[PDB]
Amino acid sequence: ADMIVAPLTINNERAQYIEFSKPFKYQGLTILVKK
Amino acid sequence: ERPFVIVESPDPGTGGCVPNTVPCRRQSAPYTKLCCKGFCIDILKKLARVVKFSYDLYLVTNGKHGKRVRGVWNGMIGEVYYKRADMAIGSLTINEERSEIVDFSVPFVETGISVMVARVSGLSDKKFQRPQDQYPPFRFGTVPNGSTERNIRSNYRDMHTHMVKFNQRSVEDALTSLKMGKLDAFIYDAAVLNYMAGKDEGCKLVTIGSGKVFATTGYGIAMQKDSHWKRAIDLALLQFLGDGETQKLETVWLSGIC
Ligand SMILES: *[C@@H]1O[C@H](CO)[C@@H](O[C@@H]2O[C@H](CO)[C@@H](O)[C@H](O)[C@H]2NC(C)=O)[C@H](O)[C@H]1NC(C)=O
Structure with a gap:
């Protein structure tokens, strides 16, 4: 491959090897529950 | 600026100031020794130990962010562009105009443009879009020389033209004027206004909330172009953010009552 366009979050391990650009949408981790 | 950085004069208790603070000089040959404390100061102090580098901190003379x-x-941008410094910590919003000359790290907090009102349905609302009705004459914020000022001037000519009669003394005078009634609405950065309503006389609030954020961006650390320090500090700060202490610092320095 040559470029990744996907919902790929940023972490230290991946940041060690590949180079990222500026982010464009913030998010977090959340819990899914059924009503 | 806002509690990211706070300047305090030394106290006669020890002929200075205690630890958890770093001496800071107000440049201008003679100097008086102040010491500065705040959020960015704390993050810099935490960062210094791991990468093991030396530092000296000094204030800006001309002031007023960047232009x-x-x-x-x-x-600060002027100071770092003319090779008079190595980094410029503190309040700074990454945009197109600034990034052309000076390199940046990853963001660490979320921010953007928000609206403050006394206790409208977005930027494209006709009240701010069509200033021609004389019965609800509104008012705005627009602290001059501001990062958001460039955006609002570049994107909407009519608003910039009609925003001339706007209160402009500080992030302090605007609150007083709004509490008085001399104006109708206020626009400025987000991370500072949402805190400013945290501990206030009564409860003055804003519109819907974080759902109304325009040109979402973050604060970042500027650095001189093409230096290994850029990559080193960026990776270190990513590791620190992944650790999770940023939430602890936020709850220590960014909590309110209302
Ligand atoms: C932005 O910062 C500059 C630099 O300090 C300020 O310069 C003033 O500019 C106005 C015209 O825009 C002049 O009338 C003043 O004489 C200048 N000096 C001072 C001390 O005010 C300016 O006030 C700031 N704001 C704007 C909108 O330019």
Whole structure:
């Protein structure tokens, strides 16, 4: 491959090897529950 | 600026100031020794130990963040562009105009443009879009020389033209004027206004909330172009953010009552 366009979050391990650009949408981790 | 950085004079308790603070000089040959404390100061102090580097901190003289008057850049950006410093920590919003000359790290907090009102349905609301009705004459914020000022001037000519009669003394005078009634609405950065309503006389609030954020961006650390320090500090700060202490610092320095 040559470029990744996907919902790929940023972490230290991946940041060690590949180079990222500026982010464009913030998010977090959340819990899914059924009503 | 806002509690990211706070300047305090030394106290006669020890002929200075205690630890958890770092001496800071107000440049201008003679100097008086102040010491500065705040959020960015704490993050810099935490960062210093791991990468093991030395530092000296000094204030800006001309002030007023950043601007471009015929290429005469003042403030921190001016200081770092003319090779008078190595980094510029503190409040700074990454945008297109600034990033062309100076390199940046990853963001660490979320921010953007928000609206403050006394206790409208977005920027495209007709009240701010069509200033022609004389019965609800509204008012705005627009602290001059501001990062958001460039955006609002570049994107909406009519709003910039009609925003001339706007209160402009500080992030302090605007709150007083709004509590008085001399104006109708206020626009400025987000991370500072949402805190400013945290601990206030009564409960003055804003519109819907974080759902109304325009040109979402973050604060970042500027650095001189093409230096290994850029990559090193960026990776270190990513590791620190992944650790999770940023939430602890936020709850220590960014909590309110209302
Ligand atoms: C932005 O910062 C500059 C630099 O300190 C300020 O310069 C003033 O500019 C106005 C015209 O825009 C002049 O009338 C003043 O004489 C200048 N000096 C001072 C001390 O005010 C300016 O006030 C700031 N704001 C704007 C909108 O330019």
